Amino acid sequence: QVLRGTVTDFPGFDERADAETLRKAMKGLGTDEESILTLLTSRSNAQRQEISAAFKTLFGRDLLDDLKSELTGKFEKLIVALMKPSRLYDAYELKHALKGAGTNEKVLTEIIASRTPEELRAIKQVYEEEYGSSLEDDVVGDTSGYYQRMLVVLLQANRDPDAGIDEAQVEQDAQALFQAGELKWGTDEEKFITIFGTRSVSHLRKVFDKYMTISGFQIEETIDRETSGNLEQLLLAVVKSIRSIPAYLAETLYYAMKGAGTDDHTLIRVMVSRSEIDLFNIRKEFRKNFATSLYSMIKGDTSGDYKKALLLLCGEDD
Numbered sequence: 001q002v003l004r005g006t007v008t009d010f011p012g013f014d015e016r017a018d019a020e021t022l023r024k025a026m027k028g029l030g031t032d033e034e035s036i037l038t039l040l041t042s043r044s045n046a047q048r049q050e051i052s053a054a055f056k057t058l059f060g061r062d063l064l065d066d067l068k069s070e071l072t073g074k075f076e077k078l079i080v081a082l083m084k085p086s087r088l089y090d091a092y093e094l095k096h097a098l099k100g101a102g103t104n105e106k107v108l109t110e111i112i113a114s115r116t117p118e119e120l121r122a123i124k125q126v127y128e129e130e131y132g133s134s135l136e137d138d139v140v141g142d143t144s145g146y147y148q149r150m151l152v153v154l155l156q157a158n159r160d161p162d163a164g165i166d167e168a169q170v171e172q173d174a175q176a177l178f179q180a181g182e183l184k185w186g187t188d189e190e191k192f193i194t195i196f197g198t199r200s201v202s203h204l205r206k207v208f209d210k211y212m213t214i215s216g217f218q219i220e221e222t223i224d225r226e227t228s229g230n231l232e233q234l235l236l237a238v239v240k241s242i243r244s245i246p247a248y249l250a251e252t253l254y255y256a257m258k259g260a261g262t263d264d265h266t267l268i269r270v271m272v273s274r275s276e277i278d279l280f281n282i283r284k285e286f287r288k289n290f291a292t293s294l295y296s297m298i299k300g301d302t303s304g305d306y307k308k309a310l311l312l313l314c315g316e317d318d
């Protein structure tokens with residue numbers, strides 16, 4: 001594993017040229033959504049920021065206010081996601097799950113499960129800088145119970161460092177998890193939230209081995225993904241991220257298209273948020289694990305400029 005994304009710095013970029021092109025495409029009645037799509041999906045995020053800066057000095061206009069007026073639908077919500085400064089997209093996405101749009105634990109479980117404690121400190125820092133309130137307090141307001149408790153544990157970003165691995169506490173933790181999991185994760189929540197939340201990744205992947213020997217099964221089996229119980233799902237997410245974030249994230253995209261529905265808000269979020277970080281890796285797991293390329297799935301569930309961009313993000317190569 002070399003963490004890679006799918007979007008890189010466009011070579012021989014001209015932020016002025018870029019911005020002018022993008023002025024013609026809005027310009028007049030009609031929109032050149034292809035021209036808009038192809039350009040910004042073929043640019044990285046920092047670059048997109050230079051083009052907004054250039055669009056303003058040139059024309060005296062707000063690039064994003066113009067995109068927000070020209071566009072609709074999901075291709076709008078996609079473009080608008082592209083133009084989010086990477087530093088912000090996650091906390092933007094946390095804010096909105098918390099504002100308005102009622103019950104959105106799916107989003108909270110996704111980010112806070114699947115970010116590295118270095119990602120979690122910055123998010124907390126930026127949100128509290130952008131929106132004025134603390135993420136942790138906002139989460140406490142809008143959540144309840146152990147699901148809340150666990151998130152607030154996860155939000156501390158304070159796991160045991162990977163160092164020496166204590167085979168005795170690996171035995172003790174896999175016990176606690178054994179029994180609690182045939183208690184339906186339904187008893188002694190305080191005890192398992194401390195193990196899931198504070199232990200090291202390298203310690204936990206060992207505990208998870210130590211379960212599959214003692215119980216003959218792997219700890220996932222003991223939960224249902226379809227059935228609710230935010231905690232169980234949060235639990236389940238942690239067990240999958242502790243094993244492998246790009247694999248968790250490739251499974252999140254895969255059930256975003258499963259059945260009736262394409263859960264576009266999950267689609268947009270992952271593609272975009274991981275695009276310059278690990279989107280490569282997420283492909284190279286989806287293929288192998290789900291046996292179809294991500295590309296073609298998306299080419300399949302989606303349609304329009306929205307799938308043009310999305311495919312353009314994904315990249316048809318490896």
Ligand SMILES: [Ca+2]
Nearest residue numbers: 026028029030
């Ligand atoms: Ca127009």
Ligand SMILES: [Ca+2]
Nearest residue numbers: 098100101102
């Ligand atoms: Ca709400």
Ligand SMILES: [Ca+2]
Nearest residue numbers: 257258259261
């Ligand atoms: Ca579908």
